[PDB]
């Protein structure tokens, strides 16, 4: 199948700055000018909710400070002005083949 | 309002069946596919199984193939997961998810699923003697 | 070596159309079969101004409610306009049978 | 993209030309430029304007009066009128949407048809004097001035005039 | 006048597939 | 003509062949005339008659009474009846006219496709034993007699049987 | 089919492959087996699911109560309601039936188009290095080792590198 | 129920005309083409003539070409055959048949016509002196 | 025309046994799984009614004991449990070209 | 019935603008295209400009390009023709005509119009010192 | 640009007979069995009016005694049964390119 890695793992920054995590896939996932990647975020004691779908859009109810981009095999999630209530775990997920595979995951927390 | 609640989990020794039900309400259930996904403690998520809208075609991952049995009852809007032939590694936290592609067709074993819209609250299943 | 090529027109039109096989495909030229623009006016239908009764209904104009004696008559009208706030109808209470008739 | 010309074996259109829907890109020892196949795209806009007239103008209506007034003692008749209005609403939205979808697909594939048929015409001429290098571009085996550019724009190519030179040039 | 439809967009395509 | 066979690379039909929608004209040392490919046009006839039956038979109308009457005291419901009849007239006219137009276009495209793939079958069964002179005609490199005609039309043409003879006349 | 690739120059289908609508059956000196193409049939699945979504969901319907009741002194309005319902029945039956039949022909033509486009892609990609032996099969004029199948199945076959040995072996074949 | 009643046959000497009629009832007429077939005495059945649903196209047997004139009418639902230049060979027993393919199109003189659904009661014709 | 004849004729068997009538055509008749043949039965003084249409199906009304099969150029009529009032004359039929050439005729008769 | 009546002409010195307008009646306006064409005092007629049915595409002649301006307003049933920088060869008798092609699409730089259906009476326009 | 032309200029013709007026184009005009020509008749002090459309058809208002013909690049106008009020100026134009050029002008006048 397809495996991916998020190179920053358990990165720590304080409130207000920028947090960048990448996502490198084993093979190409994007097709016909469309990004087949989604991001997920879970807090302790809560199910992992969707954060950004199709790697550029945004689920209604997500704050505007959460944005992401990327193409081909490399994608990035960026946090504009981290808040203390956003300490959580982020996931990659390519929904291109019948075994959707989640990334190993990264943690964002206070410095 | 989309809602996904599941129950029936607990502790189980290896070798006995366990059945889970994820009831759904507040949205058009019969026109969407559903998924099974699990959270191994201390590890990351991994896929379990998928069932399409008509329930004819089902698929499983490479780890639980031939042991699980995903099933669905659209008359009660109830998703089910027959779950047999346990081992110690199978302990995890099970979620039921909904696909994004409306009325998606799954005809082969490599197609592109949609992203997971909404998730269940999660129920604990563990394998211990 | 001399080289000829075969191609097709391309421009920067942002107009998009939806087909059966695919959705949201951009096209160079289009015509819109559905118009959603209204001038916000009650134009004269068949070149005839509507019999705008203002603050009176059909009962007020035809029966002669004194609150709308000021408005004049026309030789013809195409359709009749009533405001939603038209309450000055049959001032004496009663049953004007076949009113909608 | 059924017949496979547009978005098929053609990577994409040329934005540098505006003259026609179905254009060329000539290039010889003098230089290059853009032009359009007059007959093909003239025929294309003619047929498509016919399509537009046959869709819009054909919608045949005469005088109608939709709104109706009823009192509280005639609820059944008003409900029947409401059902009639909803039924014609449903029929018209369904047929309108499906018909416009089908017309969109047919028009896109007619464009694909014109591009592919033009490609097949220029392949029917020039039968063994050009290498089909790909993406719709012919690499000519013989140097010829704009009589051959305009001639393949123009339907009067002379194969035996350059056939022997092409045979000599190929190794 | 035409018939009322609750649809939002009816754009009858006339041009090519716009691929710059 | 989306596929581009009729009025495309073939300039026009033949008026002297009333024996099939699709045919061959062949001349050689001992035979000349027009004869039809029986199987292709027979399949075309069957498909087209099924198409016409599908268009006509889907009328499933039960016993209806369109005529209605109302005196002066219920002019409203008479206007409602007129509205219903006018709306049915409008939807039937629009749907039927555009259905007829689209079906006619599809029928012409079907006939064009039959001509095109008959030519495709012939060229595939013949390979390079003949030169594509154009106008959907073939000039053989070898003596191709009446049983050679039957081999080409029936579908049992032989490649290596005349390959050496064709190579003899090709240099 | 209107393209001659479903029961056309390719006669019968393949039950031997399971991993997609459009595929390949190849044999060489080192191995054999079916190898389904990915991108073309993935796009096919996408367009077909959009097609069925458009056919099903574009018909929107609101709440209504088509059941009406009338008494003995008002047979005319009862017959008017019956005519309205019956006319809706005929409109819906015809529009639905012709939609089903036309879309059936349209999607079969789509599948025929897709398989013919795949064949045309492989034919243009290989050209003179292979011999069209009919029934949608190419016989190479050389012994291609690996990445040849793979590059054919994803449209990135390197022509000129194999061309020298292809034409060297070609001289043995066509004099 | 289909019914193909026919009458008009009889004795006739060679060299003069004869009129035959086969009325149809119990089914819709103008959609089905109709057929003619005859039974020579002591012989087997053989082909005579056919006419389409609309009557536009009219096909003949090789044996009786140019001597038999087929026609139909849809107002009274009658299939009639005209007789020109009879010979003693024409003595037979005439049967009016109905084709099976609904609205069958006959645009070329060899196309695949349908089979015979229903057959007439038969009329006797003799060509003798 | 497509000349068409059947070999066995004037067969005579008693009640209860089998009677087979194979029928040959000079040229292929069926195509695209469309077996274009019918069998017709008449008694003396009776019109020829259809017995088996399409050479494999059954017209509603004929006894179930009458059956036939075959494809290509050989087409057989088989009678199992032949009963006394089923003595008649059987005619082949090819409706492939416009001239329907019937078989010269076969006949069954009780023994 | 169709009517093309225009006014706005007169005497204008060179270098100053002039505006012409012809309103139409008796026929549907937004569907059909519209033209301008001028007749010199003794030379003859020659084309000026054209506008599409919706007014999105405006096309000019090879002589008055860069100086004229074509516009239309379907609501007021009024055509217009603004002008910048006239010269001495602009004396003519300006005609606005109609297009015979219904809802014609004037997309590109050489497409074919229809025969000019019906014509206006012509307003006098001249330039002099 | 395609330019029109007519050979007879200010021809003088009397009442009752034929006045032919040809019209030659720079290149081909007609395409797909459609003649792209229109004639225009105007009296002095009168607006021009469409006279013959597609070079072969007649309108409402134009007298039956007057018609025209032509195909390809040479198109002819015939004056049959000339009345005194027919004194006018006749014009060619091709509506095949976006500039429809008009002819330099021909005149009929009572001999
Ligand atoms: C496209 O680009 C042109 C320049 O070539 C520009 O004038 C025009 O406004 C652009 N079109 C759109 C729709 O933005
Ligand atoms: C369609 O695609 C364009 C980009 O091509 C995007 O901007 C737009 O939001 C899309 N619209 C819909 C309705 O998907
Ligand atoms: C007319 O309507 C107004 C609405 O404000 C009401 O106050 C008034 O009493 C009415 N007059 C009559 C005569 O009905
Ligand atoms: C071809 O075309 C250009 C203009 O497009 C012309 O000026 C030039 O002379 C021509 N070239 C040759 C080699 O004749
Ligand atoms: C183009 O074709 C025309 C006839 O269609 C012919 O007269 C002409 O010579 C050809 N070539 C050029 C350069 O116009
Ligand atoms: C090449 O791939 C084939 C299947 O196409 C396989 O049998 C073989 O082992 C591979 N060989 C090499 C040399 O990579
Ligand atoms: C196609 O597959 C080959 C073989 O692995 C690979 O080298 C090539 O990059 C692939 N092409 C694309 C566009 O992915
Ligand atoms: C437009 O309105 C005017 C002014 O009322 C009227 O005279 C004219 O008849 C209307 N136009 C038409 C075409 O009827």
Author numbering:
A (entry chain L), I (entry chain M), K (entry chain O): 1 to 111
B (entry chain I), H (entry chain J), J (entry chain P): 1 to 129
C (entry chain C): 10 to 55, 55A, 56 to 83, 83A, 84 to 90, 90A, 91 to 107
D (entry chain D), F (entry chain F): 1 to 171
E (entry chain C): 305 to 324
G (entry chain B): 1 to 175
Paper text:
We chose three antibodies as challenging test cases for experimental validation using cryo-EM. Three antibodies with low sequence identity to any examples in the training set and loop lengths opposing trends observed in ALL-conformations (long loop for rigid case and shorter loops for flexible cases) were selected. These were imaged in complex with the antigen and the heterogeneity in the density maps, indicative of conformational variety, was analysed. In each structure, three symmetrically arranged copies of the antibody were captured. A potential limitation of the experimental setup is that antibodies were imaged in complex with the antigen. This choice was made as the minimum particle size required for cryo-EM complicates the study of free antibodies. Binding can rigidify residues as additional molecular interactions with the antigen impose extra constraints, and we expect ITsFlexible predictions to better match the flexibility of the unbound antibody (see the ‘Discussion’ section). For two of the three cases, the experimental evidence confirmed our predictions. Overall, cryo-EM experiments provide strong evidence that ITsFlexible is predictive of real CDR3 conformational dynamics observed in solution.
